[PDB]
Design a protein around this motif. Structure first.
Motif, PDB file in Angstrom:
ATOM      1  N   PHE A  16       5.128   7.510  -6.798  1.00  0.00           N
ATOM      2  CA  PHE A  16       3.862   6.975  -6.271  1.00  0.00           C
ATOM      3  C   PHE A  16       3.895   5.497  -6.056  1.00  0.00           C
ATOM      4  CE2 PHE A  16       2.426  10.866  -8.329  1.00  0.00           C
ATOM      5  CZ  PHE A  16       1.549  11.371  -7.395  1.00  0.00           C
ATOM      6  N   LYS A  38       2.374   6.787  -1.117  1.00  0.00           N
ATOM      7  CA  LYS A  38       2.038   7.991  -1.910  1.00  0.00           C
ATOM      8  C   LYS A  38       1.066   7.587  -3.046  1.00  0.00           C
ATOM      9  CE  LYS A  38       4.160  11.793  -4.323  1.00  0.00           C
ATOM     10  NZ  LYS A  38       5.366  12.334  -5.015  1.00  0.00           N
ATOM     11  N   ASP A  64      -2.788   9.566   2.153  1.00  0.00           N
ATOM     12  CA  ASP A  64      -1.965  10.658   1.655  1.00  0.00           C
ATOM     13  C   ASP A  64      -2.046  10.582   0.118  1.00  0.00           C
ATOM     14  OD1 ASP A  64      -0.014  12.784   1.434  1.00  0.00           O
ATOM     15  OD2 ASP A  64       1.663  11.399   1.557  1.00  0.00           O
TER      16      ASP A  64
END
Lengths: 293, 287
Positions: free
Chosen positions: B55, B4, B36
């Motif tokens: 993240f 992420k 992504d």
């Protein structure tokens, strides 16, 4: 009153000296009447200092994660006032190579040396590495460029021992320096705000011998103090620091390195200079906090 | 469920607007490339919760203060998120013009003549002494803090330019005014991209329209300049030219713009790499 964090310990090789540094700093500040608390940064995340109610920061960490600019960058982000040098100076003081380049461009004195990175190492032959340092004479000192600890440092007496010495070094850093050997002794100069504190001579035993006053003549202390302040201003340091200088066999000073978050035990160089100067530990410690930028 | 990725964009610096644009571009370029990615507007989302919010990797697309100066890098190092661009030292050092120039001088690299002044020199040296020690440069001069710019045309004008620069930094640069044109050079991983010529009446020629010997020197030179400061990931090197064809380094930008009309994307296209291929290389270099 002001809620003050003393960051101590952390997670680098000097974690132990750091716990000691911090517990001491904490005592001093208390005596000065300051409302201080110690925070082990291996267990409390510095990120949360703001979230947690701290108004000011006393950095007592050492090496990676305390004198390298990263902690500093964190603090600038939370907009917490803190002690010692800012991001740029801290990170700079850890790059022994870039430190020499800045000093040499200002005409400040530094002892002869070549630098190698990992990739030129694995590219150049033993023989060529020798041919490359021939002009520094022998013996040499091999220092990795970012370390700042003791790990990786060999003396090299004979040119066959060079490869071993470099292998050893590169297990710690992409860059390394091969420096000419100097006789010493070594001199350290504590800087406090813009005041220079009495120099200290340090030397091998016949533990490490160190002592204050240095024994330098008045003319020499002035020269050395001046040199130390140029060295430190050259890197945009501030708050406080220790400049380490190496002398040669002829009497000449060479610059080594500036430590931007110095040891603060009672065995420590900065407190010694401070005593000689007419300052109690608590007083030394409080002033450092009074300069928190 | 792959990595992420956070594209940090916006922020509160003067370059906020160009940053929104850089971020939008990077985002779409990484979508194209399969990554992504998500925009994080640092005006609204504290950088410190990037990990708390799950993240795994950061694309820095911030510009100026708070994006290219080291402070952000230190935050990311402490979160131990990998990220794009240069680390704490290189990001900070490149914001200090003096120190950048000095490192290049130690190395033998050509920089524009200048003289430097420190707070200490400024207090102890008399007004006439100060003009004495800059005489070598001629008029006009550029006075600017190392980190409040004035163009000086007259000797008596100098003092006020100093008062002014010294409010903003403890180091002040005085620079000889050089003719131009100027050039910029993108570096990516360790690859030099075509040079771009910049030119005021403003235009951008790429190819820069310099001979091959020059381009090789230029590239040879930018790369040295970039390595000197311990730059990594990617960046841009600015270089001014004199009346006779000499180059002189100026600076390195460690977080360049990545809008559609920005200079990196541009040299990238001439190098033969699409915008999306480009953001992807930058992303895969995240130390």
């Amino acid at each position: 009153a002001e809620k003050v964090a003393v960051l101590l310990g952390g997670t680098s090789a000097e974690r132990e000296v750091s716990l000691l540094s911090g517990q001491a700093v904490l005592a001093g500040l208390k005596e000065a009447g300051i409302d201080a608390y110690g925070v082990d940064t291996k267990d409390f995340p510095v990120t949360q200092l703001k979230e947690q109610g701290f108004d000011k920061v006393f950095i007592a960490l050492h090496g990676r994660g305390g004198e390298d600019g990263t902690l500093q960058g964190v603090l600038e982000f939370l907009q917490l006032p803190y002690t010692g040098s800012g991001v740029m100076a801290s990170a700079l003081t850890m790059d022994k190579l870039r430190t020499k380049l800045v000093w040499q461009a200002l005409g400040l004195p530094i002892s002869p040396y070549v630098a190698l990175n990992r990739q030129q190492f694995e590219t150049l032959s033993p023989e060529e590495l020798v041919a490359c340092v021939a002009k520094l004479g022998l013996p040499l000192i091999v220092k990795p460029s970012h370390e700042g600890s003791s790990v990786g440092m060999s003396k090299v007496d004979h040119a066959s021992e060079l490869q071993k010495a470099l292998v050893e070094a590169f297990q710690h850093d992409s860059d390394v320096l091969i420096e000419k050997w100097l006789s010493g002794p070594e001199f350290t100069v504590a800087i406090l705000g813009d005041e220079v504190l009495p120099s200290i001579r340090i030397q091998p035993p016949g533990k490490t011998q160190y002592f204050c006053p240095s024994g330098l003549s008045d003319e020499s202390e002035q020269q050395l103090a001046a040199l130390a302040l140029q060295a430190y201003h050259a890197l945009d340091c501030s708050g406080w620091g220790r400049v380490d200088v190496m002398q040669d066999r002829d009497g000449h000073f060479y610059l080594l390195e500036v430590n931007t978050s110095p040891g603060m035990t009672s065995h420590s160089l900065v407190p010694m200079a401070a005593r000689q100067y007419g300052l109690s530990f608590s007083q030394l410690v409080a002033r450092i906090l009074m300069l928190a930028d």
